[PDB]
């Protein structure tokens, strides 16, 4: 409880931002793994920074 009291402003701001963005808390679809990038073992030295 003291830990949550300490982080009260940041957790309130986070809750407001998540509510406005309309995201789902937690991680349903636990059975999800990211796809392997196309030609992954030989496609790593490619610049993708905006």
């Amino acid at each position: 409880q003291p830990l949550l009291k300490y982080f009260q402003p940041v957790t309130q701001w986070l809750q407001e931002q998540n509510q406005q963005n309309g995201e789902v808390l937690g991680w349903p679809e636990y059975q999800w793994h990211p796809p392997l990038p196309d030609n992954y073992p030989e496609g790593i030295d490619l610049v993708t920074d905006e």
């Binding site: 937690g26 349903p28 636990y30 059975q31």
Partner: protein, 50 residues
């Protein structure tokens, strides 16, 4: 050969059921204890099943 056939037929119901029962009541004990919240019903169920 007849003995093997009979015992494999019997082992298809008296051995394949052993993981079950154990599995089911382990999941239900976890749910009752609070270790499995409503957001982790399927997750823990399929973890125990696998």
């Amino acid at each position: 050969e007849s003995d093997i056939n009979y015992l494999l037929k019997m082992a298809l119901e008296k051995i394949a059921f052993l993981p079950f029962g154990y599995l089911v009541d382990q999941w239900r004990w976890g749910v009752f204890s609070g270790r499995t919240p409503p957001s982790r019903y399927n997750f823990d169920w399929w973890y125990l099943r696998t």
